[PDB]
Design a binder for this molecule. Structure first.
Ligand SMILES: *[C@H]1O[C@H](CO)[C@@H](O[C@@H]2O[C@H](CO)[C@@H](O)[C@H](O)[C@H]2NC(C)=O)[C@H](O)[C@H]1NC(C)=O
Ligand code: CL
Ligand code: NA
Lengths: 221, 109
């Protein structure tokens, strides 16, 4: 059913690569990325959203700022809060601070969130049909820190124990490789200087490599 | 028999040749950072002087991006005053003057 390749960057759904810095807030970048994409589908306007707003304000929903969080908790916060400020109005500080949410500058909302079944087939259909998808992966390996190009495959990766929130913006296959040559196109939040301009081609259809299909979701708008 | 944490930055431990020293430091690879010897390696500068093993321990957490811990197991192989010098950095960016550093000296007679 779904296409052989998808890349939502080419459709206008994806803001440039951001940088979480020395702060365990990738969950917030994964959440704003997914929300950026769904707001763009709804309105035709791509507007960068505030990770700091999530970091400072979503404690009641279960998040712990620079000590970690979950995309689903971020999506519930946006719903409970009745809005989310723009990046411009509430810039990123890479530290946990007091909540400064101002409804005057809200540019996004959500009505809930949908969790994808824990299968790469289901993740492929969601990516194809919905837009960019929030996912959790096992990023806790030196090979990931040193990633530069090509399809990332780490033999020691877990499908069950994930620690890092990122964003799947598409999938595809390498012309050059030829056996296990498919990948997920993943936007990270470590700046443009990491990986392929900030992106990693994560191995796809290699038994849910790094747990990419194990905790995937998106906000409903 | 010898454990060391951040609390012991700059200390000297006297050890026997062949004795293991465990270094434990906060580390969060989900932020892109980890601890390294100069040049962005986990290996000893001089294997004949001391050996190093390194392992990351993820936190027990329902959340994504909680900090964990790196352990460095250092074994001294000869008499000397062995400097173990680590820097916390993103390896593709490298260090700066501001980077967090950890040093311990392992002294064997
Ligand atoms: C998203 O959330 C709320 C809830 O719908 C929106 O606020 C309402 O806006 C409508 C239409 O303009 C008004 O009739 C209501 O008075 C508002 N109700 C409120 C404030 O609870 C809000 O405008 C939306 N935010 C964004 C950024 O689109
Ligand atoms: Cl933490
Ligand atoms: Na966990």
């Amino acid at each position: 059913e779904a296409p052989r390749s998808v890349d939502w960057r080419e459709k206008g759904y994806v803001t440039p690569v951001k940088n979480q810095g020395q702060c365990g807030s990738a969950w917030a970048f994964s959440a704003t990325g997914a929300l950026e994409g769904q707001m763009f589908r709804k309105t035709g306007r791509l507007i960068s959203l505030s990770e700091q707003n999530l970091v400072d304000c979503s404690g009641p929903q279960g998040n712990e700022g620079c000590n970690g969080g979950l995309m689903d908790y971020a999506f519930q916060y946006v719903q409970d809060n009745g809005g989310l400020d723009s990046e411009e109005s509430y810039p990123y500080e890479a530290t946990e601070e007091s909540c400064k949410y101002n409804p005057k500058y809200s540019v996004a909302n959500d009505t809930g969130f949908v969790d994808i079944p824990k299968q790469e087939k289901a993740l492929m259909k969601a990516v194809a049909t919905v837009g960019p998808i929030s996912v959790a992966i096992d990023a806790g390996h030196e090979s990931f820190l040193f990633y530069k190009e090509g399809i990332y495959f780490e033999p020691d990766c877990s499908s069950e124990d994930m620690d890092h929130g990122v964003l799947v913006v598409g999938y595809g296959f390498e012309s050059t490789e030829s056996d296990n040559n498919k990948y997920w196109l993943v936007k990270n939040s470590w700046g443009e200087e990491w990986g392929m301009g900030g992106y990693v081609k994560m191995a796809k259809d290699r038994r849910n490599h790094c747990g990419i299909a194990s905790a995937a979701s998106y906000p409903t708008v | 028999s010898h454990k060391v944490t951040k609390a012991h930055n700059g200390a000297t431990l006297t050890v026997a040749v062949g004795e293991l020293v465990e270094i434990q430091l906060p580390s969060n690879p989900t932020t892109g950072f980890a601890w390294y010897f100069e040049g962005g390696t986990k290996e000893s500068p001089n294997e004949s002087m001391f050996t190093v093993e390194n392992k990351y321990f993820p936190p027990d957490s329902k959340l994504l991006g909680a900090g964990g811990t790196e352990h460095f197991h250092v074994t001294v192989k000869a008499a000397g005053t062995h400097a173990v010098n680590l820097t916390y950095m993103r390896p593709w960016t490298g260090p700066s003057h501001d980077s967090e550093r950890f040093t311990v000296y392992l002294k064997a007679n």
